[PDB]
Design an enzyme around this catalytic site. Sequence first.
Site, mmCIF file in Angstrom:
data_model
loop_
_atom_site.group_PDB
_atom_site.id
_atom_site.type_symbol
_atom_site.label_atom_id
_atom_site.label_comp_id
_atom_site.label_asym_id
_atom_site.label_seq_id
_atom_site.Cartn_x
_atom_site.Cartn_y
_atom_site.Cartn_z
ATOM 1 C CB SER A 170 -14.169 6.110 6.547
ATOM 2 O OG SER A 170 -14.577 4.993 5.435
ATOM 3 N NE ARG A 171 -8.140 1.565 4.834
ATOM 4 C CZ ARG A 171 -8.123 1.340 3.953
ATOM 5 N NH1 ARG A 171 -7.496 1.594 3.003
ATOM 6 N NH2 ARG A 171 -9.603 0.417 4.097
ATOM 7 C CB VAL A 172 -11.144 7.137 2.042
ATOM 8 C CG1 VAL A 172 -9.920 7.435 1.111
ATOM 9 C CG2 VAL A 172 -12.355 7.431 1.598
#
Lengths: 70, 49, 52, 502, 468
Positions: free
Chosen positions: D364-366
């Site tokens: 996940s791109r946070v």
Amino acid sequence: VQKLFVDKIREYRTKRQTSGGPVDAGPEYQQDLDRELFKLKQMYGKADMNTFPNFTFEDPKFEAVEKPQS
Amino acid sequence: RKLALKAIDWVAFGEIIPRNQKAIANSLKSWNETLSTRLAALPEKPPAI
Amino acid sequence: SVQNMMRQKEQEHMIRWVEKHVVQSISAQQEKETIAKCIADLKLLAKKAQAQ
Amino acid sequence: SSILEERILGADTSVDLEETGRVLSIGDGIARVHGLRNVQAEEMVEFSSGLKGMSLNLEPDNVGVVVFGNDKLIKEGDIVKRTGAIVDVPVGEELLGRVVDALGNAIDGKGPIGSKTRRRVGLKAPGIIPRISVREPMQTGIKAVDSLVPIGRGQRELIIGDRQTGKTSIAIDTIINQKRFNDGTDEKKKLYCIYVAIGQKRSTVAQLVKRLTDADAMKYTIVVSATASDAAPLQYLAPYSGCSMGEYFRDNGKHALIIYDDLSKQAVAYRQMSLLLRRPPGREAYPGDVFYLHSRLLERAAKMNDAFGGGSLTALPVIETQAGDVSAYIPTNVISITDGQIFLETELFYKGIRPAINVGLSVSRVGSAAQTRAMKQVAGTMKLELAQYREVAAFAQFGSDLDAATQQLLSRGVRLTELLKQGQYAPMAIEEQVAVIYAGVRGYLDKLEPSKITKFENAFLSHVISQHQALLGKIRADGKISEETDAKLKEIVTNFLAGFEA
Amino acid sequence: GAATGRIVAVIGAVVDVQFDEGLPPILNALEVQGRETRLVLEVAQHLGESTVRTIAMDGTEGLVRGQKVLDSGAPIKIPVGPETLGRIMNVIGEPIDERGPIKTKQFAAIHAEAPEFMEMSVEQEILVTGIKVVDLLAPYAKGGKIGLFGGAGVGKTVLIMELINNVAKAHGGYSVFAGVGERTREGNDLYHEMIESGVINLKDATSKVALVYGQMNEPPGARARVALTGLTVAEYFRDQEGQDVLLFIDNIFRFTQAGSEVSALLGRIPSAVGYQPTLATDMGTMQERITTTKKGSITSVQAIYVPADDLTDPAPATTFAHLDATTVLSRAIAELGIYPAVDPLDSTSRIMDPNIVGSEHYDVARGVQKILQDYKSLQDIIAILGMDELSEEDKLTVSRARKIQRFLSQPFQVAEVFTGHLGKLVPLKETIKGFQQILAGEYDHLPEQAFYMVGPIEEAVAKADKLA
Ligand SMILES: Nc1ncnc2c1ncn2[C@@H]1O[C@H](COP(=O)(O)OP(=O)(O)OP(=O)(O)O)[C@@H](O)[C@H]1O
Ligand SMILES: Nc1ncnc2c1ncn2[C@@H]1O[C@H](COP(=O)(O)OP(=O)(O)O)[C@@H](O)[C@H]1O
Ligand SMILES: [Mg+2]
Ligand SMILES: [Mg+2]
């Protein structure tokens, strides 16, 4: 079509002259409204009109513990 | 809201030490946990009619 | 749950009685259709007037 | 009865000249219409019997039209009329708590929805200036999601996996879990939800409204429903209509959420609808622009700047894959539109990890790391202690013994793996999550047995909500777990561990 | 005589017909004049300038151009009612039992719509069958759809002859069977096994089951519409009589296999591996009428075929969204001898839940999948290296999960004539009790040849008592 506007109200007033439920039920509406009246009670339950809750509950009996000590 | 409190009695209460009566206390706290929150949701009042 | 189900069975029958009775009442008329045609001309006479 | 008579006096019998095209053919849903000179593309045309349709192809001789309904009332020689509007659905907050079909007519029977504003299903995603980055969190209440794979507000996250692994349940614990914010006081912690059912039988969607109404979840959602019995142009139009009720919220200030269940059934409704219009097939007989079909959808999920309203629109597309293969045609075209994924598997579900999330692969791109401040402390170290576990814990055949060296670290994982399991339709809170995660990483569970930690959790959790309510209210209010708040928790876990099993 | 038409073109089972005035609406019926039998054409398309394209229910050989065609006025209607029980029909509803006509008061069209949203019933229960693989891991419901996926030669109909032999005996309401595209000697041994066992009564009105048949000799305009026929006799017994009807369909794949044989000739570009462009809209219009509702309850059991043993093929893999239970059978299981060859890892339900199936049962369920997965996840290493390079804990999920596979095979009642072994029915409460004594580890001294093809658990220790 306001000539059709008057002609569906005036044959709605004829339906407002009713004696016993359906006008042309015969064996149709008598069987269907009795088939449906069972199904609202069949898988639902056997319930009377006004009977209150009649039951009685018993709690857990408090046993004692025997203990020679010191 | 008829409800009673208690004291912190979980540590040595299983250490009652009867004549090998370990099941007497090990069943005793086991009844104590489930009866606590379940009778709390009984004790106060019934809902609106 | 009995009050609502007997309203629903009654509601659909009340609709079809007004609906199936108007089919013969509109079919029988023979004098008012000539009245119905001249207003159908006058609506079309009114219709093209607002376009141009 | 007074209700039927008042419905018939309010009816308007307006008559005007139409614009009209004779039908030349009707087969399998496509009605090639002679006539219809000034018709637009994507215009809504209306057949004589009450049906409705949308003219897709324009051509010099005929005009291709697809039907929203059934093609058996339509005979060659019929009459097709002109509405004069590209296809639009009603919109508003007045649809909240309903089940609706793909054109905004109620299929619940509570009546006519009173709606005032209409919004197209083909509008455009906003560009580069009116966005902002992702500041806020979106709490799911799952513990493997909130700690390890967090999801911001305004981020497209893809739930992908097989059939019967947990893809619908993951996105329904999320619907339930926002109950606690929606009866609260601030208007900026709420999350209004939307569920789009594509290709599902009605004995699943009428059963999910039951699960969402005992918990009183249905008072803040909408259900746009296009079942498997519907016309193939009604399963194609459904996510473009559901996404356009989401943008009443986002373009006015609030925060929305939208689940497409699923998007592998909005593709086979485009493959069929556009083969009978004689369009040449591409790969697997899919059209040329299945990538353009999904991309013009998943870019409206914005996060606007604060000089427009600041509202957000999350999206959670579900994708069913065949035999767990992720390199198919429609999966890979939608992996590369979303910021992050959640890879649900089958061997996790059956070994016992349920929710079966592959926490190794669930990248996940946070989302500017808007996890939250206290969870960063306990799940920052958890993320590394679990990553340390997975490199070294796959033998199943032991020959040597290194309890000081290896067997201490893998004992920290099974205590944190069996902590991560959850139930169903009972989602936690975030400070009830900080407490139970505190007790796992701080060594306070290595003297248990792993077959007792699921039993340890509910006895712990009932003790803290009952006896320690003013403790958890200082984690939720102050955000962080302070050093004096670190002090008070140090006894509570050890006082409970002193008298847990007795 | 609403309209008169002449045959214009004939390609196989797609007869073209031109009318002059009075075009028939789609899915009417047309009557071909000048034949010895009845030939009914059903309108499919409207090809422009007074010309329809039809699909024929019987054979089209011997037709010439110009041959007259007459318009009925209505779809294919069949006689429905309580006199349909004990009678066999075909696609147009004519008695093929040679016992004379079917005299009912009413007639039912083949094509009707689907139930609405607000006529659905959500109530779930458990229908205990008597099969261990289905009671434990994937419990059936009372009012929900069931599928039995399987290849060719695995057991999808020996399994469906059990759910008649266990459920249609102890049923109180009626029953409906349909045969869609499977062989005709099997459709004869269901007549001479329901007459002998009192379900068909040839002499008065005390019969329970109806029958409807279109087999694998018909033209493909009949197999594509025989499944909508038994589906109509099992709706009168739901909506207008209000009963609790069963419904057994075998095989429902041929509704779709024989729909991509007339879709090429209607003028359509094909979709993927060769199927019709509308594969999954005609299936969701047949399956959306087989429902439990607020007026009755249909308990479907459908057998489904997978082509060339492939579960990702588009015809099986779009049926999955229409089920409640699922029993994926397998070929490699049945090479070992485990019959019913059910895949325990691929079979689901929607009622396997700790609040519905009971929290004691739900933990023997999920706890026996956990030990079964862990036997699968070491088959790479056991096949190459050996059993003898394992630990001591993982020689105890191998020996315990080979006692569990063998204790899922049960002798059936219908299979006594094959092998000469007594068919066993177990109850529900004696399987949960009998798997907790393999998971806890009480039988770890008995061999694995004792858990095989036995009924309740006391036969396993008795078979172990025999060999000594
Ligand atoms: N948190 C959970 N723990 C254990 N079991 C669960 C959990 N969530 C769901 N399940 C079970 O897993 C099964 C499948 O879940 P679900 O129906 O959401 O899968 P799905 O993939 O959406 O199904 P479909 O493939 O039909 O869309 C259900 O029987 C459900 O009861
Ligand atoms: N329970 C069972 N026990 C033993 N043999 C079986 C069992 N079920 C199926 N078989 C074998 O497998 C074959 C399955 O064929 P059948 O079920 O008739 O049709 P299908 O090919 O559709 O499965 C049977 O002929 C039988 O030999
Ligand atoms: Mg799902
Ligand atoms: Mg067979």
